[PDB]
Amino acid sequence: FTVTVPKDLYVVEYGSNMTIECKFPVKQLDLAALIVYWEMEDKNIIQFVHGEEDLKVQHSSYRQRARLLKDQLSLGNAALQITDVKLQDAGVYRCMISYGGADYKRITVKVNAP
Amino acid sequence: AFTVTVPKDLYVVEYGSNMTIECKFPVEKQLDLAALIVYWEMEDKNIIQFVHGEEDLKVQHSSYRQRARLLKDQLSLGNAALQITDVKLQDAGVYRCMISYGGADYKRITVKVNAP
Numbered sequence: 001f002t003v004t005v006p007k008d009l010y011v012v013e014y015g016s017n018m019t020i021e022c023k024f025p026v027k028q029l030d031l032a033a034l035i036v037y038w039e040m041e042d043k044n045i046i047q048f049v050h051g052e053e054d055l056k057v058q059h060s061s062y063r064q065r066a067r068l069l070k071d072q073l074s075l076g077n078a079a080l081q082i083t084d085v086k087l088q089d090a091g092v093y094r095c096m097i098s099y100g101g102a103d104y105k106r107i108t109v110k111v112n113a114p
Numbered sequence: 115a116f117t118v119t120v121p122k123d124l125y126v127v128e129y130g131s132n133m134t135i136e137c138k139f140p141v142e143k144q145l146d147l148a149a150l151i152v153y154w155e156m157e158d159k160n161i162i163q164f165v166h167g168e169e170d171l172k173v174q175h176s177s178y179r180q181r182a183r184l185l186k187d188q189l190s191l192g193n194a195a196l197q198i199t200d201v202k203l204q205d206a207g208v209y210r211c212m213i214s215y216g217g218a219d220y221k222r223i224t225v226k227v228n229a230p
């Protein structure tokens with residue numbers, strides 16, 4: 001099992017939305033076996049465990065601002081959507097995916113002002 | 115839900131001593147090696163990649179060849195214990211143990227080495 005980032009650097013305009021993608025291999029999807037986790041500066045962004053997001057562990061600064069696009073998991077794409085990106089959202093994100101095997105990658109986000 | 119725990123997230127060790135750094139994880143009955151992944155890392159360097167019962171030495175960073183062990187007799191007790199023989203200063207740093215056994219979780223451990 002291997003997780004891939006076709007793009008490991010993203011340049012997003014401030015105040016944009018951003019969707020950063022980690023690809024993992026896809027038969028039909030076994031939601032009960034899949035765990036997708038995203039993180040940045042060791043803050044819990046997304047904890048997608050067997051079927052859905054657990055928001056009791058998501059960090060304050062990401063409540064109602066971060067989303068894993070559920071309709072894209074079927075395509076073997078863990079896609080993290082951060083709305084209204086701020087300068088602080090620049091940094092190094094980590095998708096960790098558990099789905100049979102287990103792997104992780106790094107994506108770097110740089111945020112321009114206008 | 116599934117959580118990895120770390121009784122000690124700071125290890126102060128002597129130059130050239132041995133160190134064993136632990137991440138505990140829950141186990142009910144018999145340990146099911148096929149369901150279990152344990153991975154250890156420091157500074158983006160692969161140390162241990164114990165997946166489905168067998169260590170992978172192809173992926174293991176050269177600086178840990180012959181130097182690093184995942185203690186299999188501890189796994190059964192829900193304890194993932196990375197053993198590093200003859201620690202040098204190059205071993206100080208932040209270690210992550212990432213564990214997949216049913217759920218998934220990871221923890222950090224900081225390793226400080228006093229000098230020779």
Ligand SMILES: COc1cc(-c2cccc(-c3ccc4c(c3)OCCO4)c2Cl)ccc1CNCCNS(C)(=O)=O
Nearest residue numbers: 037096097098102103104115116153212213218219220
């Ligand atoms: C289930 O939540 C996580 C899930 C993973 C996760 C997700 C996907 C893959 C992996 C993983 C595991 C082993 C690996 C690996 C990746 O890549 C390399 C090979 O070894 C891992 Cl760790 C990490 C952190 C978390 C945060 N848990 C907060 C805890 N407390 S609570 C109250 O929420 O329960």
